[PDB]
Design a protein around this ligand. Sequence first.
Ligand SMILES: [Cl-]
Ligand SMILES: [Cl-]
Ligand SMILES: [Cl-]
Ligand SMILES: [Cl-]
Ligand code: NA
Ligand code: NA
Ligand code: NA
Ligand code: NA
Ligand code: NA
Ligand code: NA
Ligand code: NA
Ligand code: NA
Length: 129
Amino acid sequence: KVFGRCELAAAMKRHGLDNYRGYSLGNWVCAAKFESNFNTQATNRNTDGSTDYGILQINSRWWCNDGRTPGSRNLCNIPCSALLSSDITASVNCAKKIVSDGNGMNAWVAWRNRCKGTDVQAWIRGCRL
Ligand SMILES: [Cl-]
Ligand SMILES: [Cl-]
Ligand SMILES: [Cl-]
Ligand SMILES: [Cl-]
Ligand code: NA
Ligand code: NA
Ligand code: NA
Ligand code: NA
Ligand code: NA
Ligand code: NA
Ligand code: NA
Ligand code: NA
Protein backbone atom coordinates (compact mmCIF):
# COMPACT_ATOMS: atom_id res chain seq x y z
CA LYS A 1 0.00 0.00 0.00
CA VAL A 2 1.20 3.49 -0.77
CA PHE A 3 -0.18 5.79 1.88
CA GLY A 4 -1.10 9.38 1.41
CA ARG A 5 0.78 11.82 3.62
CA CYS A 6 -2.12 12.75 5.91
CA GLU A 7 -3.42 9.14 5.75
CA LEU A 8 -0.15 7.82 7.19
CA ALA A 9 0.05 10.55 9.78
CA ALA A 10 -3.42 9.53 10.98
CA ALA A 11 -2.52 5.81 11.13
CA MET A 12 0.69 6.52 12.98
CA LYS A 13 -1.20 8.67 15.51
CA ARG A 14 -3.84 5.99 15.97
CA HIS A 15 -1.02 3.48 16.75
CA GLY A 16 0.52 5.76 19.42
CA LEU A 17 3.59 7.08 17.52
CA ASP A 18 2.71 10.73 17.90
CA ASN A 19 5.23 12.01 20.38
CA TYR A 20 6.50 8.53 21.20
CA ARG A 21 9.84 8.92 23.05
CA GLY A 22 9.40 12.66 22.48
CA TYR A 23 9.32 12.52 18.66
CA SER A 24 6.43 14.49 17.21
CA LEU A 25 4.31 12.96 14.46
CA GLY A 26 6.02 15.02 11.79
CA ASN A 27 9.35 13.31 12.55
CA TRP A 28 7.78 9.91 11.87
CA VAL A 29 6.09 11.00 8.63
CA CYS A 30 9.28 12.61 7.40
CA ALA A 31 11.26 9.44 8.19
CA ALA A 32 8.70 7.31 6.36
CA LYS A 33 8.78 9.68 3.38
CA PHE A 34 12.52 9.34 2.84
CA GLU A 35 12.73 5.68 3.82
CA SER A 36 9.94 4.35 1.64
CA ASN A 37 8.03 7.18 -0.01
CA PHE A 38 5.11 5.92 2.07
CA ASN A 39 5.10 2.42 0.41
CA THR A 40 4.55 -0.44 2.80
CA GLN A 41 6.08 -2.85 0.28
CA ALA A 42 9.47 -1.10 0.03
CA THR A 43 12.52 -3.40 0.41
CA ASN A 44 16.23 -2.55 0.04
CA ARG A 45 19.28 -4.74 0.33
CA ASN A 46 22.21 -3.59 2.37
CA THR A 47 25.88 -4.13 1.60
CA ASP A 48 26.24 -6.40 4.65
CA GLY A 49 23.54 -8.76 3.29
CA SER A 50 20.78 -7.58 5.62
CA THR A 51 17.54 -6.12 4.10
CA ASP A 52 15.35 -3.16 5.09
CA TYR A 53 11.52 -3.67 5.05
CA GLY A 54 8.46 -1.52 4.97
CA ILE A 55 7.46 2.11 5.48
CA LEU A 56 10.25 2.68 7.97
CA GLN A 57 12.81 0.39 6.35
CA ILE A 58 13.42 -1.81 9.42
CA ASN A 59 16.67 -3.79 9.16
CA SER A 60 16.82 -7.63 9.39
CA ARG A 61 20.23 -7.35 11.04
CA TRP A 62 18.54 -6.73 14.43
CA TRP A 63 14.81 -6.45 14.26
CA CYS A 64 13.10 -9.06 12.13
CA ASN A 65 13.62 -12.54 10.72
CA ASP A 66 13.98 -13.09 7.00
CA GLY A 67 16.00 -16.30 7.11
CA ARG A 68 18.81 -14.90 5.02
CA THR A 69 20.74 -12.57 7.32
CA PRO A 70 23.55 -14.59 8.91
CA GLY A 71 24.31 -13.86 12.51
CA SER A 72 21.30 -11.51 12.84
CA ARG A 73 18.72 -11.03 15.60
CA ASN A 74 14.92 -10.78 15.51
CA LEU A 75 14.29 -8.39 18.42
CA CYS A 76 10.81 -7.46 17.31
CA ASN A 77 9.93 -11.18 17.18
CA ILE A 78 8.34 -10.98 13.74
CA PRO A 79 8.95 -12.21 10.19
CA CYS A 80 10.28 -9.33 8.15
CA SER A 81 7.33 -9.93 5.75
CA ALA A 82 5.00 -8.59 8.44
CA LEU A 83 6.62 -5.25 7.90
CA LEU A 84 5.24 -5.12 4.33
CA SER A 85 1.57 -5.36 5.26
CA SER A 86 -1.06 -2.71 4.33
CA ASP A 87 -1.73 -2.63 8.12
CA ILE A 88 1.17 -0.70 9.74
CA THR A 89 0.75 -2.21 13.23
CA ALA A 90 3.85 -4.44 13.07
CA SER A 91 6.03 -1.61 11.68
CA VAL A 92 4.89 0.80 14.36
CA ASN A 93 5.33 -1.65 17.23
CA CYS A 94 8.81 -2.57 16.02
CA ALA A 95 9.74 1.14 15.43
CA LYS A 96 8.79 1.86 19.07
CA LYS A 97 11.37 -0.74 20.16
CA ILE A 98 14.02 0.64 17.79
CA VAL A 99 13.56 4.27 18.86
CA SER A 100 13.88 3.10 22.51
CA ASP A 101 17.20 1.40 21.86
CA GLY A 102 19.30 4.41 22.99
CA ASN A 103 19.96 6.59 19.87
CA GLY A 104 16.45 7.69 19.38
CA MET A 105 15.51 8.38 15.79
CA ASN A 106 19.21 8.50 14.80
CA ALA A 107 18.71 4.73 14.32
CA TRP A 108 17.26 5.85 11.00
CA VAL A 109 20.19 7.30 9.10
CA ALA A 110 17.79 9.04 6.70
CA TRP A 111 15.96 10.72 9.56
CA ARG A 112 19.29 12.08 10.82
CA ASN A 113 20.38 13.31 7.38
CA ARG A 114 17.04 14.59 6.03
CA CYS A 115 14.60 15.20 8.86
CA LYS A 116 16.56 16.04 12.01
CA GLY A 117 16.52 19.74 12.74
CA THR A 118 14.18 20.59 9.86
CA ASP A 119 10.62 21.91 10.01
CA VAL A 120 9.10 18.42 10.44
CA GLN A 121 5.69 19.89 11.30
CA ALA A 122 5.31 20.64 7.54
CA TRP A 123 4.76 16.87 7.11
CA ILE A 124 1.45 16.97 9.07
CA ARG A 125 0.39 20.47 7.99
CA GLY A 126 -3.20 20.58 6.84
CA CYS A 127 -3.97 17.08 8.04
CA ARG A 128 -7.09 16.39 10.07
CA LEU A 129 -5.74 14.50 13.05
CL1 LIG B 1 4.36 13.91 0.24
CL1 LIG C 1 5.34 17.55 14.03
CL1 LIG D 1 18.51 -14.93 9.29
CL1 LIG E 1 15.93 10.82 22.06
NA1 NA F 1 0.83 0.15 -4.45
NA1 NA G 1 13.23 12.75 22.17
NA1 NA H 1 11.77 1.50 -2.04
NA1 NA I 1 10.12 -4.09 -2.51
NA1 NA J 1 18.47 -10.06 4.00
NA1 NA K 1 8.91 -0.60 8.36
NA1 NA L 1 5.45 -1.07 6.48
NA1 NA M 1 16.52 -13.30 12.35
